[PDB]
């Protein structure tokens, strides 16, 4: 199943919701991740240039897709086919961001 | 501020997350709405044709906006400038729905 992360729009995009698939994929329970920026999923061999593109896209509230190396709670690396999009109200205000890890199987 | 509702994609789209603004707007706490379809927000003067358009859009995972009459927990009517969109993974599979109540001032 596809993992989903929802964050606040502002400050440092703290996580406000993760679906059940997120916990299966990453080994983290909601209470371990809520209120944190999702960058804790990154680790030593995560590609800096990819992280920079995510940083610029989120700052601009621009949708982005990247294949990024992430790490489970237990330290095991996994490839995250990650897509991030802003949630806008009808005035164009950004209310949240939504991140999806596409189950590519 | 703008309210946000996140639901599962399948079965009867049970609510899995509401933002702080949702509780301020509707008078419902998260524990009062989690696992329920959002239709409990409707009441006697809600326009049936508006509800039917939402029903068809969600069934087909099509984005839709409607101005729908909803009811706070205390029964006060309020105009909900509602926008709903599917959350898709990169295969096109629907992972969730997101609903926004636009704060129009
Ligand atoms: C909704 C959302 C979901 C995200 N999910 C992930 C993720 O699953 N894995 C990841 O490495 N980064 C994810 N990020 C990105 C990080 O939170 C952060 O934006 C990125 O590392 C770039 O910014 P930084 O250079 O400040 O860390 C997500 C961001 C947002 C807004
Ligand atoms: C994510 C999401 C948010 C929704 N938010 C609202 C809402 O705020 N107010 C409302 O009247 N209906 C809302 N709905 C619509 C109802 O859940 C339902 O789809 C609608 O009443 C039409 O279907 P029905 O005829 O089966 O009730 C939402 C639906 C989804 C999927």
Author numbering:
A (entry chain A), B (entry chain B): 48 to 152
Excerpt from the publication:
To verify the transferability of the blue-shifting Q489K mutation, identified for the plant FbFP iLOV, we introduced the corresponding Q148K mutation into the recently presented thermostable CagFbFP protein from thermophilic phototrophic bacterium Chloroflexus aggregans. Much like iLOV–Q489K, CagFbFP–Q148K possesses a blue-shifted S0→S1 absorption band with a maximum at around 444 nm (≈3 nm blue-shifted relative to parental CagFbFP) and a blue-shifted fluorescence-emission maximum (≈6 nm blue shift relative to parental CagFbFP; compare the gray dashed line and solid blue line). To verify that the structural changes, which we observed for iLOV–Q489K, are indeed a consequence of the introduced Q489K mutation and are not due to the observed succinimide modification, we obtained the structure of the corresponding CagFbFP–Q148K variant. Altogether, we were able to obtain three types of CagFbFP–Q148K crystals, all using the precipitant solutions with pH of 6.5 (data and refinement statistics are summarized in Table S1). Interestingly, the protein also crystallized using another precipitant solution for which we obtained crystals in two crystal forms. In all of the obtained models, the C terminus of the protein is clearly unlatched, and the side chain of the introduced lysine is facing away from FMN as was found in iLOV–Q489K. Thus, the succinimide modification present in iLOV–Q489K does not influence the backbone and the conformation of the introduced Lys because this modification is absent in all CagFbFP–Q148K structures. Therefore, we conclude that irrespective of the buffer and post-translational modification, the C terminus of the iLOV–Q489K and CagFbFP–Q148K variants is unlatched, the LOV core domain is opened up to allow solvent ingress, and the introduced lysine occupies an extended conformation facing away from the FMN chromophore. The photophysical properties of the CagFbFP variants are relatively straightforward to interpret.
Flavin-binding fluorescent proteins (FbFPs), engineered from prokaryotic and eukaryotic light, oxygen, voltage (LOV) photoreceptors, are promising fluorescent reporter proteins. Their small size (about 10 kDa for monomeric FbFPs such as the improved LOV (iLOV) protein derived from Arabidopsis thaliana phototropin photoreceptors) and their oxygen-independent fluorescence make them ideal reporters to monitor transport and anaerobic biological processes. In contrast to GFP-like fluorescent reporter proteins, whose absorption and fluorescence maxima can be tuned by exchanging certain chromophore-constituting amino acids, the absorption and fluorescence of FbFPs and other flavoproteins depends on noncovalently bound flavins, whose structure cannot be influenced by mutation. Using spectroscopy, X-ray crystallography, and quantum mechanics molecular mechanics calculations, we provide a firm structural and functional understanding of spectral tuning in FbFPs.
